[PDB]
Design a protein around this ligand. Structure first.
Ligand code: AZG
Ligand code: AZG
Ligand code: AZG
Lengths: 288, 288, 288
């Protein structure tokens, strides 16, 4: 909540609207390595976070920290290239700030992507996990983008999250993967947000396994929470860039340079998939 | 700890004492929907949080955010109507601030109430759960009202919480329910504080089940911790206003308007019960 | 991260270096009750945290809050007597600050010690637990000393922790215990950091058991994370000063005055052990 106020989201929404011919319907937050999706846009208009009025600017990236509009598979999009994370210092009400403006920009659906670790044994690095649920660890402790006075203008005080990932789109997703007649079926599991920038220890990965998590990451959850709070259809995927959970001879135990999950390769796939998916996102035209 | 200092709790305690004929023995924090208990008071004196010197004022409520004194079943009380929550922005050392003044006001027992979600399957919405234990999730991460320099004037650095809910009063509680010859027996389980304002997801509810929790809420724990820190007899109940933990067809999955647990109905019951309970709280007169 | 900057760690490192003839190789953070190890030092030079430029000063202790150099078993040491904890108010980037200067002082190995609770049933108060892994609970929520912009000068953005406690030294540790031909074998388990100053409840201890933890404490984890981030060999022990996990008649349920684990007795033992251990820490001379 804090730091920003409604006119803050209202001045930014307007600044963008009055600076772009585009009026986005779908907002797409690309995860690490998935920024490529921006290339798929047409009639694109690239704004620098830096440029936009109250938009948090990047801590290091910047370049791989831009907001591009345009179109994807027949949907007026707006892809945030280079999402913000709590571990960069951004308070969660800066992390999720974009989502609040996308809503005022008219966005009604938010597709978020990310790069997690593979907790579930069945996963194979490279797999794309459809997020069916999430475990908001920072939220349990207090780190929830909604903390602070509730702005009924955006939504409720106690919004529910048991319905976060829109059954419909998840269906249309599982179907679509099948339409394409793909190899490894679109995975589906719970994503566990873990704040910290360092990577989990074996002992930690195991508690994440026990907790129910399928993939671990340091983002998404914040954007999903406030998006839902605004009443935004939300669905997303998680590129499984690696995996671990074994003391009994770590062997590899990751590093990060390991995270790439056949970089170009898989990143390209999750991207095309999301793009194909634009056609399964209800058009504000009601369609009938 | 932070923000306030001893004279802060000392000026407020005195301001109240020198503004009320009353000298409370029991302090009662009413949960959402349980504010009605204030009606049961006699010779009551309603102060507005706003009015009291260093007392955190409400973020939105205010009205359903008052401090009323008076008497309940032969006990000099002081009921905080409209408790503060971490999710409203209040730092935990503002949430629990009242408890620290109640102690300086002479309060020796603190009965807290709340409205949780029903994790334990045996629970039936409407049930009243006697809190036998708690799992302080925000505490594990750092969100503990005691964090900061310890004020030995109030208590220890490392107070123990394994004894928080006073065996005695829990006994007298289970007995009392039986005296009244009630229907569903006074439930008894562990309350898990979860900070965030949004509601838990199915995936989250399950980790709360696995963790051992019986009911989920966003308060109480902070007040119980510092109350105990002062050396205050503490016991409390949790009105089960709902329940969930099922992906396999959510069906209802809550909302909040669902939370009421037969509002007037059950809220009234937990209230009378607490009031009857005043008679089972040791009188400072030692009684003998 | 925050608050300090590189010249901050650079001015302090230099201030110390230009104020001590010593150039530490090993940095030893002593836990509560283990400050005695300082006595084992020779040619020792005691600086007051207070004295050192940007060094966080103690909240209460101070005296039992000093930085002593000198030598231990043929290793140029620097023992921080009286470590900082998150529960004293110190932001984690003050807690771990010393580690960042020890690195600039040339320290290459960090041996941390602490006093936990005994979660694992096999443990007997007095036991010394070799830390083989850790569960960073405050980290999951956001409380990670690395949060904020990454300083590539010190290390990576996403350092891994699956390798934190250096296999080698753990081996040399288990062996050494055996060399000495001791009684109860050097225990080995996962340490779970829990922030809060109050002690865990029975309900909490059980989730710590389920999570996988073997011993609970309120420190170490922060120092281990940034030490590893700098690329510092890290290993440590945990003096088991007590234990609990039982509603079914608490009986003792601790207090803190119980924590001592045969104070002088066991504290002395873990100390001599660490000192003997100086001989198993690779000398920067490469040794060959
Ligand atoms: N937390 C987390 N853990 C892993 O193992 C990851 N791999 N890629 N992103 C990751 N994030
Ligand atoms: N956390 C939480 N969860 C539920 O399901 C609740 N119902 N009423 N208060 C509640 N608080
Ligand atoms: N958290 C924690 N718990 C116990 O039981 C302890 N005993 N000594 N330090 C301790 N720290």
């Amino acid at each position: 909540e804090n730091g920003y106020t409604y006119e803050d989201y209202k001045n930014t929404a307007e600044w963008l609207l009055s600076h772009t011919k585009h009026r986005p319907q779908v907002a797409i937050i690309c995860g690490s390595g998935l920024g490529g999706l921006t290339d798929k846009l047409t009639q694109a208009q690239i704004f620098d976070y830096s440029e936009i009025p109250n938009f948090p600017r990047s801590t290091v990236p910047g370049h791989a920290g831009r907001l591009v509009f345009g179109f994807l598979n027949g949907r007026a999009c707006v892809m945030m290239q280079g999402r913000f994370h709590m571990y960069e210092g951004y308070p969660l009400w800066k992390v999720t700030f974009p989502v609040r403006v996308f809503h005022l920009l008219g966005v009604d659906t938010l597709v978020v992507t990310n790069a997690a670790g593979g907790l579930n044994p069945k996963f194979e690095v490279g797999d794309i996990m459809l997020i069916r649920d999430h475990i908001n660890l920072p939220g349990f402790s207090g780190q929830n983008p909604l903390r602070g006075p509730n702005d009924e203008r955006f939504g409720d005080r106690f919004p529910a999250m048991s319905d976060a990932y829109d059954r419909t789109m998840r269906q249309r997703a599982l179907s679509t993967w099948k339409q394409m007649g793909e190899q490894r079926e679109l995975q589906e599991g719970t994503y566990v947000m873990v704040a910290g920038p360092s990577f989990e220890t074996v002992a930690e990965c195991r508690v994440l396994q026990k907790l129910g998590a399928d993939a671990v990451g340091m983002s998404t959850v914040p954007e999903v929470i406030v998006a839902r709070h605004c009443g935004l259809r939300v669905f997303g995927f998680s590129l499984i860039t690696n995996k671990v959970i074994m003391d009994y001879e770590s062997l590899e135990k990751a590093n990060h340079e390991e995270v790439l999950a056949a970089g170009k390769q898989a990143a390209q796939k999750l991207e095309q998939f999301v793009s194909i998916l634009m056609a399964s996102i209800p058009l504000p035209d009601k369609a009938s």
